[PDB]
Amino acid sequence: MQPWGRLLRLGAEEGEPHVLLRKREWTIGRRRGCDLSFPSNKLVSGDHCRIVVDEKSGQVTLEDTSTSGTVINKLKVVKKQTCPLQTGDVIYLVYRKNEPEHNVAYLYESLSE
Amino acid sequence: MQPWGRLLRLGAEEGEPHVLLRKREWTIGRRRGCDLSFPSNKLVSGDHCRIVVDEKSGQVTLEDTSTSGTVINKLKVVKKQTCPLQTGDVIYLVYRKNEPEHNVAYLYESLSE
């Protein structure tokens, strides 16, 4: 299969090693048989999560199979629907991928927790 | 009602003005009657989105009622379920609010689009 994605350790430069995702079901965990494992990290489950690519649509999905869970930083597009808000979130009333100068954004913070 | 939240323009210091959310249904748009309006911005709908607070549970929600839509930066916790992935997302295998030194994270990037 041809390379559909990759992982880079947060904060790494370009001259740093990256992880090539060349399968359909990439496993991550503490166990030895995982494609990406961390044998000495107890905060990571034996089978923590897997990243899968849809053969036809090309949609990539992550499935958590752990005790703790997995956290993802996303840029959710809300169109004519609902979405929960949480302290620390940032709301973009205007978001232009090609004209970032036009971005209009506000950080949301709760006055409780 | 007592202040449940607030908005701060992205990048502002602490000495900058913020928006106090003291209602139940805060409206944002281009129209004049919106609680927060941008009369001269054509990339913003007359009634773009509203932020609402659940009286009992305290859950805050944003509802988009626009032509374009609204973008939100979130930190989604995935536990024993599914979640779509997209270029630019960051995956935290380990995420400790109090011990950030233990964070284990990887930036995900697609090799297509």
Q: What is the CATH number of the domain that holds B2?
A: 2.60.200.20
Q: Strand pairing partners for B90?
A: A73, B107
Comparing CB atoms, the residue among A59, A62, A83 nearest residue B62 is A83
A90 lies in which domain range?
A: 1-113
CA distance A11 to A50: 22
Task: Please choose, from the candidates A3, A40, A93, A47, the residue with its C-alpha nearest in 3D space to the C-alpha of residue B43.
Answer: A93
CA distance A50 to A64: 7
The two most distant CA atoms of chain B are separated, in Å, by 50
Element at B40 (helix H, strand E): none
Taking phi first (over 0 means left), then psi (-120 to 50 degrees means alpha), and beta for anything else, what does residue A77 get?
A: beta
Task: Please choose, from the candidates B107, B33, B44, the residue with its C-alpha nearest in 3D space to the C-alpha of residue B71.
Answer: B44
Burial group, residue B43, by CB count within 10 angstroms (0-12, 13-18, 19+): middle
Q: Work out how many domains chain A is built from and give that number.
A: 1
SS3 assignment, position A11: coil
Task: Please choose, from the candidates A74, A17, A16, the residue with its C-alpha nearest in 3D space to the C-alpha of residue B87.
Answer: A74
The structure tokens listed for A60 are 């990539």
Amino acid at B25: E
B100 Cα to chain A: minimum distance (Å): 13
Task: Please choose, from the candidates A92, A47, A4, the residue with its C-alpha nearest in 3D space to the C-alpha of residue B86.
Answer: A4
Give all strands (DSSP E) within A1-113, no chain letters: 5-9, 19-21, 25-29, 36-37, 49-53, 60-64, 70-78, 82-84, 90-94, 104-110
The structure tokens listed for B100 are 């950030």
With tokens 């956290």, the residue in question is A71
Q: What is the resolution of this structure in A?
A: 2.0
Amino acid at A87: T
CA distance B61 to A18: 37
The structure tokens listed for B37 are 């309006």
Contacts B88 to A, Cβ<8 Å: 75
Contacts B4 to A, Cβ<8 Å: 110-112
Comparing CB atoms, the residue among A66, A78, A107 nearest residue B10 is A107
B8 Cα to chain A: minimum distance (Å): 5
CA distances A11 to B23, B37, B89, Å, are 40, 37, 13
CB contact under 8 A, B111 and A4: yes
CA distance A10 to A8: 6
Q: Strand pairing partners for B26?
A: B51
Q: Strand pairing partners for A92?
A: A105, B71
The structure tokens listed for B109 are 């990037």
